[PDB]
Design an enzyme around this catalytic site. Structure first.
Site, short mmCIF file in Angstrom:
data_model
loop_
_atom_site.label_atom_id
_atom_site.label_comp_id
_atom_site.label_asym_id
_atom_site.label_seq_id
_atom_site.Cartn_x
_atom_site.Cartn_y
_atom_site.Cartn_z
N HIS B 351 -23.80 -5.74 23.27
CA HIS B 351 -22.80 -6.59 22.61
C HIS B 351 -21.47 -5.92 22.29
CE1 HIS B 351 -25.68 -9.91 21.62
NE2 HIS B 351 -26.55 -8.91 21.69
N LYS B 542 -13.06 -14.79 11.05
CA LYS B 542 -13.92 -13.81 11.73
C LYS B 542 -13.93 -12.58 10.82
CE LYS B 542 -11.12 -14.13 15.28
NZ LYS B 542 -12.00 -14.26 16.46
N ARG B 543 -14.83 -11.65 11.04
CA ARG B 543 -14.85 -10.43 10.25
C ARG B 543 -13.51 -9.68 10.38
NH1 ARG B 543 -20.00 -8.45 8.16
NH2 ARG B 543 -18.60 -6.71 7.59
N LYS B 548 -9.72 -6.86 15.99
CA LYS B 548 -9.51 -8.30 15.99
C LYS B 548 -8.04 -8.69 15.65
CE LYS B 548 -14.46 -9.28 14.94
NZ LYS B 548 -14.86 -10.26 16.00
N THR B 650 -17.61 -15.84 19.83
CA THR B 650 -18.23 -17.16 19.78
C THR B 650 -17.50 -18.14 18.88
OG1 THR B 650 -19.74 -16.34 18.11
CG2 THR B 650 -20.55 -16.38 20.35
N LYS B 654 -16.50 -22.38 19.25
CA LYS B 654 -16.67 -23.38 18.19
C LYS B 654 -15.39 -24.16 18.02
CE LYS B 654 -19.55 -20.02 15.77
NZ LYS B 654 -19.63 -19.13 14.65
O1 LIG Z 1 -24.85 -3.14 12.07
C1 LIG Z 1 -24.49 -2.70 13.18
O2 LIG Z 1 -24.80 -1.52 13.48
C2 LIG Z 1 -23.84 -3.55 14.11
C3 LIG Z 1 -23.63 -4.92 13.85
C4 LIG Z 1 -23.01 -5.74 14.81
C5 LIG Z 1 -22.56 -5.22 16.04
C6 LIG Z 1 -21.98 -6.00 16.97
N1 LIG Z 1 -21.71 -5.62 18.22
N2 LIG Z 1 -21.17 -6.66 18.86
C7 LIG Z 1 -21.14 -7.68 18.02
C8 LIG Z 1 -20.59 -9.05 18.41
O3 LIG Z 1 -21.60 -9.73 19.17
C9 LIG Z 1 -21.19 -11.08 19.48
C10 LIG Z 1 -22.34 -11.80 20.12
O4 LIG Z 1 -22.51 -11.24 21.44
C11 LIG Z 1 -19.93 -11.09 20.41
O5 LIG Z 1 -19.51 -12.45 20.64
C12 LIG Z 1 -18.80 -10.30 19.79
O6 LIG Z 1 -17.77 -10.15 20.80
C13 LIG Z 1 -19.31 -8.90 19.31
O7 LIG Z 1 -18.29 -8.18 18.60
N3 LIG Z 1 -21.64 -7.31 16.83
C14 LIG Z 1 -22.78 -3.85 16.28
C15 LIG Z 1 -23.40 -3.04 15.33
C1 LIG Z 2 -19.22 -17.79 14.85
C2 LIG Z 2 -19.13 -16.97 13.60
C3 LIG Z 2 -18.66 -15.60 13.68
C4 LIG Z 2 -18.20 -15.02 15.00
O1 LIG Z 2 -16.82 -15.35 15.18
P1 LIG Z 2 -15.91 -14.45 16.18
O2 LIG Z 2 -14.58 -15.13 15.96
O3 LIG Z 2 -16.53 -14.62 17.54
O4 LIG Z 2 -16.01 -13.06 15.66
C5 LIG Z 2 -18.59 -14.84 12.51
N1 LIG Z 2 -18.96 -15.34 11.31
C6 LIG Z 2 -19.40 -16.59 11.15
C7 LIG Z 2 -19.81 -17.10 9.80
C8 LIG Z 2 -19.54 -17.47 12.29
O5 LIG Z 2 -19.99 -18.75 12.17
#
Ligand SMILES: O=C(O)c1ccc(-c2nnc([C@@H]3O[C@H](CO)[C@@H](O)[C@H](O)[C@H]3O)[nH]2)cc1
Ligand SMILES: *Cc1c(COP(=O)(O)O)cnc(C)c1O
Ligand SMILES: O=C(O)c1ccc(-c2nnc([C@@H]3O[C@H](CO)[C@@H](O)[C@H](O)[C@H]3O)[nH]2)cc1
Ligand SMILES: O=c1[nH]cnc2c1ncn2[C@@H]1O[C@@H](COP(=O)(O)O)[C@@H](O)[C@H]1O
Ligand SMILES: O=c1[nH]cnc2c1ncn2[C@@H]1O[C@@H](COP(=O)(O)O)[C@@H](O)[C@H]1O
Ligand SMILES: *Cc1c(COP(=O)(O)O)cnc(C)c1O
Lengths: 810, 810
Positions: B351, B542-543, B548, B650, B654
């Site tokens: 991911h 988003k986070r 980002k 994702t 949405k």
């Molecule tokens: O706690 C951790 O160690 C941790 C958490 C999340 C992630 C993480 N790596 N990629 C993601 C997000 O995954 C979504 C679903 O595939 C993608 O849409 C995002 O692009 C990606 O940042 N999250 C990596 C490490």
């Molecule tokens: C879909 C969703 C995300 C992921 O959004 P990205 O813009 O792809 O990072 C994060 N947090 C919440 C609560 C969501 O519903």
């Protein structure tokens, strides 16, 4: 099948079956193909619980509307045991549930055995609180039990190599279907901080907050449709608590530890900070709840007309300064008015005179944890001592003795003195104990305020302790005198007209024999051990303590063994000697006593010359559910505390009700039991209180008894030389040294009379008809020891409310 | 009222009302006079839950009988949100429940708002797992989600003085009616110990044991009567744990801390021991459950025919050596056979390519905690490198790059390399990301085993993300093309025939306008702030992370402010700029970005010259339930990560589904969205991946952009000089210093094209008809981004199972 278990009507049975299947499917999410016996137990418990809830809602609604005086019973312990059978008994559902489960291919007795005891107490004090709740509901009183929902109750006892090992009692693992969480009535409790004095009074600031979340459990009365509440508080951290991030979340456990575990001491004050936190936690949450309910009925003059608070020993004694804090600091009442309200509201029950059991908290602890309460305690003390000085001018030593503050290396607060000062009634728990309070430890207080001091002799509920645990006995009684005795135990006196009735004699003996067979089989199944069910069942079950003198029993057992070995071909009445009970984890001598009992068993039970004439069994994990099995099976009840040490006892009463004869000292309620049955129908031996006092004035010298009694000397030589511990010959030297040089409880002084009295027991057991006639005389006169009688006396003489046997509508 | 919410039949409504009242009385123990809105929510949730349980039992029974291949989705995160509405949607109960509650005098929408989010994830990865569960159930797959039941989920975010504060998310406080504890399937998990080598293999001994207790939650498919299971493990200490006595009981918390709290990091590897314990805990309990179920259908050759294990990133990577441990040490398979089974069973989804996100565990940690697993990892590595050496003889640097063991100051295990070696399939999550994996970080692995590498572009469930959150849009679509699109989203293509339809244009715009009004009102009620609902709603949620580029958005907002202040009397399209998201507690720069956003708001929102032309709002506590409210209200979706950094995204999907246009870089799934809709219907700007690479080869120099762009220089001077922080003039110097000297994400490099592209957005918004026509073209082509499509591809290309839209009988 049996009348006292109620009707099994076709409609009722059909409805119970339907609801059982409904809960199995929807509540438990199982089908019959993957359901375990535990799932079946839960489906039954939810089915029975449904029958409580309508009555519970209606009862609480009725109290809101009528607004009677409310009774609040504050305790750190509620030793409830199992709930399923008790609920069925009180709702008259037992036969219907039996039939319903039978038609589903299930054995209800097997399902009952799956339920965990709610083991939220140590012994007698906790169990008394449970009996009291049952009686308050049965007598229609608007009563609430308030305590702590411990996550871990009294430890499970395992015996390994003859030694006690402790295991955590994770009683909530599978869920508790009886409780209802009420997170909506969550309340804050404060700790630490400091006191600020402003223009308009003291303020307690900079405190740490812990939340008290209540869980409510229904308490059904006997067939009267009353369901009262036991409200138990659980500790939760607020969500901003300590708020790097991860550690702050993990540290929430520090606040939540308050409700984690029951302190496992019986008659011993340990003095730990966590215990003090528990005491304040229960008091502070409970008092807010009381005040809320009072305001939702300015004027606190009516507070003692609407509220009674009963303090179960000194454990909730902080209620007195907390009530004062709320009234003075928050409601802004003047001190004198607040004190009047407090005294009229609170009453205190004392449960022990042993000095090591009395709570005496170090001032430095209270100063840090509860700085405002310490200030209030000092003010109470000064005002109280001012009254003492006016009544007894010049008596400076009396001022020192009566002070709430004890001087010494570390200053301490004497919580019993606080309770007396702040209560309108102080009671002991049996006549002899209440007299001892007035003559010895509270003599000074009695001289100042004689009107405060009362007696309320303890009792037990005949629902759990006859109908539930001994249905065969309940039934043969009911066949003669009807069913009304179950809520009016004095009606057992009518059985004296059946002391010469041959059929009744036969039935009483038959029921005992059945109970003994059932218990002998239980022992084989669960613990791989064989006993002769024709032997006399000689039972001592209670917590292990030097004052209770399990050691005296051990000396008799060894005496019997040595007599057999001396004259192996002489007839002796066969006995199965059963001793059981838990030792507190830190009480070394109690743990050694357990080891001695198992070591005696290892020798006696494997000696081929003894045969089945004598067996010694240590009953593992003694608890309420085990009491319900062993007590109906007992022939001889051992109640052998040193005169003046057992405040009342309640095990004694359970045995009397269930057709055992008693061998005992004139201690606690034994005195009143003997008075009710007649001394001729009791096996009384040993020093009276006055004889103990005479020995103490002269000096107890155990060596004198050793020198004069050859049978006793032989036993001590056997213990010392390694006869009962061949691989570790000195294993018992601490026991020998204590008995010979530092025995506070005078074991040797009662040995000779105890052995002689035991010979009289054996002689009577040889004549089954006369034994059974004596049994009938005991059962017939046990009515006084109903907790219904006890509660009616509290209600009339302390709380100022009238009991009622009137039924609420269904 | 609306068709897609199902039928409200008289029988159904009557039955729901009856059961609601039944639960209120028997389950909750309340009457209508003292019930709170929370009680009404619980009574509704239990009512709806009852409709699930029959289908749940039948589904699990059906899988036992048919014995299909089972899919196990292992994740440390399941970001579920609320359950009540989703359950109603999937069971076609929404209109019936609405009518039933309405007849009881209750508003169902108000009751829905009481439910807590199940916040057991951080963001995209956790939410993907939740969407996947919904799609697997809808496609009739025998699928199980396995994770950890955290007591505390993602922290609740409060903003105080413009700064993020964290509060514990005590989501279980009031109970969770959706889960079922299954204490009967409790399993032991081992930690620490040591390895003993015997005659017949290795033995892992002297371990500490923690129990894993499962809680099951139902996962309903869309209107097909399939209910799958999410099984979450909770940590419990055994009852002999540490068994002075009191401390030993309190120390049970040390074992139970494993399931206490979710680590709140998104795309950042922290390397803490507690996290490693969590990873192993979930893996070890899950694998025992898998093997149990397989044996209850000797011969592990059929294991990969009956089991697929999907690893959600490397977090459950220990499944690979754990499977080997069980097969080799416990089942006594030879290594080669065990390895074949393992590889055919496991598949790995990557991911992220950010280096700080990759798990690289120190060897010393694994050595202490999991000594047998470390031995197995070393053996895997040696055998794997032996294959590399045979394929690329002499290429010693390749051996070093591909090793599972990284050399250095501290030796580490690279968990991604372990996952590739031990899986038969490795996939990325969008086409561009899967290509990047093959060209850059996993190039060596791709050259050795090209057949392993796949793409599976992410998706979202149209149940939660259209029907549930935007019923007005779902309905106007359904009026034209029917309801089948809800489980076959490609049918949205039919909407292209309604791009010139005047009525449809009007309805699409009307639904957006209603959603905007509803959200504007929500903001006023819950957060005391006023917005113009005729303004363009420009949303970035988003986070918070440097990659980002919330900072790029901030630069645009300030640019717009400065332009207004320069020419105050010129018309500009009014905007409400909304930014929301959580920062990880230890991520200092992310916390500073939040403070910057609120500080910009404090200046912009109070400048009377701006008026309602521009408002900047920080949306507090962004979470799934808030996403469901804000996304349907959005006009412009900000998807502005530096090319090559967002693996998929994702949120982007949405927004597309719900009638927002997108301004974005050619990153992640944005590339595929633009391809589906047409580039003319997307606002694309900025560097492509290849342009980023060209800048990196030359050297990124931010000063060049500052020197050449006067508007950018003005903003940096404003930040530096204290314009946005008058009382603390240097508050933002860390942000300025990073942007000027250490910006890994090249914010300045995309500034000019971003601002120009934003001007094109404003120009289109002035022509509502053409804006709405472009919207229709986006919604119509969003079908590819259904998670139903994603799961069907996993099923066919990785797991070897066929999806089904066949309904089980009700
Ligand atoms: O706690 C951790 O160690 C941790 C958490 C999340 C992630 C993480 N790596 N990629 C993601 C997000 O995954 C979504 C679903 O595939 C993608 O849409 C995002 O692009 C990606 O940042 N999250 C990596 C490490
Ligand atoms: C879909 C969703 C995300 C992921 O959004 P990205 O813009 O792809 O990072 C994060 N947090 C919440 C609560 C969501 O519903
Ligand atoms: O934890 C403690 O600090 C603690 C616990 C129990 C007791 C205690 N004190 N007395 C009792 C028993 O109370 C019952 C009920 O009144 C009596 O029948 C017993 O005689 C008494 O020992 N228990 C004292 C202190
Ligand atoms: O406003 C009211 N109307 C009717 N009954 C009430 C009201 N408030 C409290 N009650 C009753 O009292 C409640 C329980 O009392 P509590 O223990 O003081 O909360 C409920 O069981 C109700 O039956
Ligand atoms: O012996 C059996 N007979 C019928 N069904 C069974 C049996 N054992 C398991 N099952 C089914 O499988 C169970 C769930 O599967 P588990 O998740 O492997 O426990 C139950 O839901 C049953 O429906
Ligand atoms: C009644 C009871 C006690 C009290 O017995 P005494 O002999 O009065 O000490 C202790 N424990 C249990 C489980 C009981 O039922």
């Amino acid at each position: 099948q049996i009348s006292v278990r109620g009707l099994a009507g076709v409609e009722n049975v059909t409805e119970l079956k339907k609801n059982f299947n409904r809960h199995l499917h929807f509540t438990l999410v199982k089908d019959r193909n993957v359901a375990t016996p535990r799932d079946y137990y839960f489906a039954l418990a939810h089915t029975v619980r449904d029958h409580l809830v309508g009555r519970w809602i209606r009862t609480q609604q009725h109290y809101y509307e009528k607004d009677p005086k409310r009774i609040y019973y504050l305790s750190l312990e509620f030793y409830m045991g199992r709930t399923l059978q008790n609920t069925m008994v009180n709702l008259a559902l037992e036969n219907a549930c039996d039939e319903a489960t039978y038609q589903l291919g299930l054995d209800m007795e097997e399902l009952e055995e799956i339920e965990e005891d709610a083991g939220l107490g140590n012994g007698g004090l906790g169990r008394l609180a449970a009996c009291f709740l049952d009686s308050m509901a049965t007598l229609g009183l608007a009563a609430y039990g308030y305590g702590i929902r411990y996550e871990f109750g009294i430890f499970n006892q395992k015996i390994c190599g003859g030694w006690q090992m402790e295991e955590a009692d994770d009683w909530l693992r599978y869920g508790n279907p009886w409780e209802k969480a009420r997170p909506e009535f969550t309340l804050p409790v404060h700790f630490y901080g400091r006191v600020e004095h402003t223009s308009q009074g003291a303020k307690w600031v900079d405190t740490q907050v812990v939340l008290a979340m209540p869980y409510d459990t229904p308490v059904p009365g006997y067939r009267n449709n009353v369901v009262n509440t036991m409200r138990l508080w659980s500790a939760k951290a607020p969500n901003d608590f300590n708020l790097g991030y991860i550690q702050a979340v993990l540290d929430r456990n520090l606040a939540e530890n308050i409700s984690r575990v029951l302190y496992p001491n019986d008659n011993f004050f340990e003095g730990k900070e966590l215990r003090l936190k528990q005491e304040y936690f229960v008091v502070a949450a409970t008092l807010q709840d009381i005040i809320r309910r009072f305001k939702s009925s300015t004027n606190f003059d009516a507070f003692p007309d609407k509220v009674a608070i009963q303090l179960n020993d000194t454990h909730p004694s902080l209620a007195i300064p907390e009530l004062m804090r709320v009234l003075v600091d928050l409601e802004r009442l003047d001190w004198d008015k607040a004190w009047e309200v407090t005294v009229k509201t609170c009453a205190y029950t004392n449960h022990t005179v042993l000095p090591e059991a009395l709570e005496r908290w170090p001032v430095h602890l209270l100063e840090t944890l509860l700085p405002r309460h310490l200030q209030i305690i000092y003010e109470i003390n000064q005002r109280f001592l001012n009254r003492v000085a006016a009544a007894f001018p010049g008596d400076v030593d009396r001022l020192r003795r009566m002070s709430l503050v004890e001087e010494g290396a570390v200053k301490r607060i004497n919580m019993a003195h606080l309770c007396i000062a702040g209560s309108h009634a102080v009671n002991g728990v049996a006549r002899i104990h209440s007299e001892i309070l007035k003559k010895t430890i509270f003599k000074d207080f009695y001289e100042l305020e004689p009107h405060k001091f009362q007696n309320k002799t303890n009792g037990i509920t005949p629902r759990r302790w006859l109908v539930l645990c001994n249905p065969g006995l309940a039934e043969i009684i009911a066949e003669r005198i009807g069913e009304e005795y179950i809520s009016d135990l004095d009606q057992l006196r009518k059985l004296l007209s059946y002391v010469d009735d041959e059929a009744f004699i036969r039935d009483v003996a038959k029921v005992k024999q059945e109970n003994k067979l059932k218990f002998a089989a239980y022992l084989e199944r669960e613990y791989k051990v064989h006993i002769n069910p024709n032997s006399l069942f000689d039972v001592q079950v209670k917590r292990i303590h030097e004052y209770k003198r399990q050691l005296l029993n051990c000396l008799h057992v060894i005496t019997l063994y040595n007599r057999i070995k001396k004259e192996p071909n002489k007839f002796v009445v066969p006995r199965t000697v059963m001793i059981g009970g838990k030792a507190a984890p830190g009480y070394h001598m109690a743990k050694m006593i357990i080891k001695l009992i198992t070591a005696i068993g290892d020798v006696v039970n494997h000696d081929p010359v003894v045969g089945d004439r004598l067996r010694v069994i240590f009953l593992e994990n003694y608890r309420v559910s085990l009491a319900e099995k062993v007590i109906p099976a007992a022939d001889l009840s051992e109640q052998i505390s040193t005169a003046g040490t057992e405040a009342s006892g309640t095990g004694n009463m359970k045995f009397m009700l269930n057709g055992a004869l008693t061998i005992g000292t004139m201690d606690g309620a034994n005195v009143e039991m003997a008075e009710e049955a007649g001394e001729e129908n009791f096996f009384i031996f040993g020093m009276r209180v006055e004889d103990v006092d005479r020995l103490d004035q002269r000096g107890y010298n155990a060596q004198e008894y050793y020198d004069r009694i050859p049978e006793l000397r032989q036993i001590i030589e056997q213990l010392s030389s390694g006869f009962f511990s061949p691989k570790q010959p000195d294993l018992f030297k601490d026991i020998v040294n204590m008995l010979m040089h530092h025995d506070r409880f005078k074991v040797f002084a009662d040995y000779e009379e105890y052995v002689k009295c035991q010979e009289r027991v054996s002689a009577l057991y040889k004549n089954p008809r006369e034994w059974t006639r004596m049994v009938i005389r005991n059962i017939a006169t046990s009515g006084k020891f109903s907790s219904d009688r006890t509660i009616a006396q509290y209600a009339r003489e302390i709380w100022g409310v009238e009991p009622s046997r009137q039924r609420l509508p269904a």
